[PDB]
From Swiss-Prot, chain E:
Species assigned in the record: Ovis aries
Key words of the record: Electron transport, Membrane, Mitochondrion, Mitochondrion inner membrane, NAD, Respiratory chain, Translocase, Transmembrane, Transmembrane helix, Transport, Ubiquinone
Main subcellular location: mitochondrion
Designated name of the protein: NADH-ubiquinone oxidoreductase chain 4
GO biological process: electron transport coupled proton transport; mitochondrial electron transport, NADH to ubiquinone; mitochondrial respiratory chain complex I assembly
Pfam families found in the cross-reference section: Oxidored_q5_N (PF01059), Proton_antipo_M (PF00361)
GO cellular component, one term: mitochondrial inner membrane
Superkingdom in the source lineage: Eukaryota
Amino acid sequence: PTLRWQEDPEPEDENLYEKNPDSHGYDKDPAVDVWNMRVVFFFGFSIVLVLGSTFVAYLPDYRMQEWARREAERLVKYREAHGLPLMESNCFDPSKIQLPED
Amino acid sequence: FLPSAAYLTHQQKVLQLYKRALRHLESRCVHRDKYRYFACLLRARFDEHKNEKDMVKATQLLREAEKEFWHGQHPQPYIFPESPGGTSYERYECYKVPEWCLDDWHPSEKAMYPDYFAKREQWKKLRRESWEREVKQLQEETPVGGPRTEALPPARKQGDLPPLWWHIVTRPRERP
Amino acid sequence: GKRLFIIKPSGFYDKRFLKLLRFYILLTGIPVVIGITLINVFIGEAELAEIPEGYVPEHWEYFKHPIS
Amino acid sequence: DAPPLTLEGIKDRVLYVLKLYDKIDPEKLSVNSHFMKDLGLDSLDQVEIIMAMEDEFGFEIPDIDAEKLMCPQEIVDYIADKKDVYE
Amino acid sequence: MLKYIIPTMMLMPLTWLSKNSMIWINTTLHSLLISLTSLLLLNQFGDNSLNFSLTFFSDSLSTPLLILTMWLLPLMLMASQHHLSKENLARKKLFISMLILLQLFLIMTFTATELIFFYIMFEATLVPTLIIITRWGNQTERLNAGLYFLFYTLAGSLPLLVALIYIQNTMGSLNFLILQYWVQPMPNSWSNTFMWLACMMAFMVKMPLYGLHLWLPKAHVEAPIAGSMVLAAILLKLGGYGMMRITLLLNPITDFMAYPFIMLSLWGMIMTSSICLRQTDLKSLIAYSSVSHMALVIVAILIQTPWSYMGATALMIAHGLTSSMLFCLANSNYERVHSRTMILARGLQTLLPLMAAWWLLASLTNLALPPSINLIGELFVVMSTFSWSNITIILMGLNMVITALYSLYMLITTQRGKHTHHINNILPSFTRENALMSLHMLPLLLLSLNPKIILGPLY
Amino acid sequence: SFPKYEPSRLASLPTTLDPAEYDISSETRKAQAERLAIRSRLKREYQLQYNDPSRRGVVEDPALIRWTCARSANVYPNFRPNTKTSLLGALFGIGPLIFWYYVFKTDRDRKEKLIQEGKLDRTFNISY
């Protein structure tokens, strides 16, 4: 014969429909739901996502890319025009180095 | 394992052996006339000692019938293509939309079908009206404190609908 | 009179969401695509000059499409 | 695939496939009938009749119903409970 | 960077002095303006990073993760209703301001010039997430979850500070370039062994690895939705980001000492894919999925190929978006039915009709559907690790097999076969649910169309 | 006419050839009676708590909740670390790791010494 509590039987369950059947996301103030739908589907997509996609679709050449294409064209035309072999090894001058010898 | 009893019975077990043997012999034997011959042969094989009196010798021979049945069954029997364990096996379960739905809508599509929803509304009135006292009094009144059976008696005394009828009557068509 | 009754679950919220999504993407789906069309149909992209003598370049005038 | 059936016609077809069986009479093939009282045949050939209904209508009826059909009207009622043939 | 930080300052008293029924619109609109503001970042090119201030900078190691943070923030705040709408306004404002403060310390962590500043903002990320998950964990062992969480993360993250102070007072200041451009090889001495072990073990706690992986799943299944998403995505990928920062030094001894951690992450990856094949509590399946992905990431980090680093950061961003989505899916199921299990809520093909497409697309992003970022990451990591060893592709492919199996079983277990028809309270799909679906998978598929951004600094 | 159907952990021993059912006991009759009574009482309580029109939420089955709390919470309490349990853990958790660790040391040392010899196909071995 004991109860150990005083409070109400919980959870008293809630149903977001059946009082405002035109409902988007949150609670039953009827105008501000339309304000929410307006602000997220305009100011989240129609000014953010597709516009940022067209922003990042082309932009300055990230990591030197077409710059390196045209520089590769010019330098390979150079090294094939002078007879010397392209991409010579020993990337620094062996006269401009001093080994600690044996 | 069965709803309305605890054991099946001896006659039921003989009948289950007879059904399974008949089904497996169907599945074994094509051309259907040699099958009809072998089925009458099986019927004669059960006619050879149909009139036995020793109960324990009868259930012994039923056991050995299961032995040579399990040795002599069919590999992949002709399951019915409407049956459980089959090619259909709720094939059109795609459109078994449960009927607690169809009212969780917007009143545009409720305005599209007005008469069926008004008639469902009076179905729901007919459910809610005769629900608590009559049905739960017949459930809590007539059986023993341990019910000890799954089957339910109908509303047999005088009046209204049989008890707990909703999710038994209101079901899909099983072929829409 | 031959047809039966069928039970779809709910089409309202589906069609509302998809109608709002296409309408609120195409609300700037038209001016952005037509504007980038007008940029690459009017203004000219670029050409391939070398360095003019005694003239330092800008940090722009490097790019193919001029919105970049 | 699903032709329009009816209760009268399915009673007609079950009547037909009952009457084509050998050792019964076409006299007392009534709705108010038995497979124990008037026709007097045994459990074994009664379940052979049950097998004939499964052969015609193309679906299983269980062993838990094989105890408790025992007459043609309840057979037609249970197949009507299966296929659910109404406008 | 202060152009990003000071509006995140002024957005904090916004939550205080915004009126009733207007906090939502204000926070959402200003958060998406911050999303464009960090979309304005990507000026980095070529030779090096963008080094901006007397102090700060931004790497392309940091660029897509920073964009991921300030794009998760609206999604963070928009998921975080319908379980506190009926609760109080003061606690509501406190929760929103705590999220903004947590994001702020995350962005301070991503703008780390000095590793001491990195460490301070690391555990500054650590501390309020505790408060979020304990005050709104909504299950009976959020207590033990937060307790294990903070104690594991501090106790692993303790000697990293001492190692960083030692590197400070033996090699000059701790700017990343003067820590770079100067660092000498450190040979096989056991001081180097414990220094490597301290740094890498603190981050192994942060990833998590396999031996310390009970740290994670309680802190996901007993946490609120925005806390769980931010915790998972930004903290685990932040730990990987920090290892990518610090591992430039101690490179002669890491081939000597790597072979235990490589083995532990591989065999734990297979065991983790095996353990999340069978369990109930659907929320925990994504948690051990995250453990599998981070073990793959850790194998990719402790091998030292540019291919491996680019595939690693691609897998980081891909699993961040995928886990945020799939956590929102589990939130949808739990807000429908108070179950938290897997076998109770079933069916959902007829009911909630377009939810099926998002469950499918979530399981396909987790499947590594082939043009997606997930398969780019996992494939190039498999390429680099098969270069690193001719025999380790067996564990990678068996990982892929069991990974496909458990993710697709997660699909066909909750949304295939039968509606249980004893539930009869679930409502049709809200616009908010599929709106968050669109917020998740439109940037992921657009970066699938144009993935020239998200690869690492060795692009 | 049959070798009496050896069973398995994989295949099923069917309900027909038990053969211990055919030794019908009165205690098996009482067992089936009480078992059907328990199933009847649980089904009757389920049907009475199911078909109500005011029942908004879920049926709240304590059986599934009991199974989940058995699978997750009540495993670690309680536990007795046995020689069997510790041996099985150390052999199925750490043993495979030390075994594949040995074979990865083996393959790496062979590959490193092989490329140190110079007799590898690294004529072009570009993207490592």
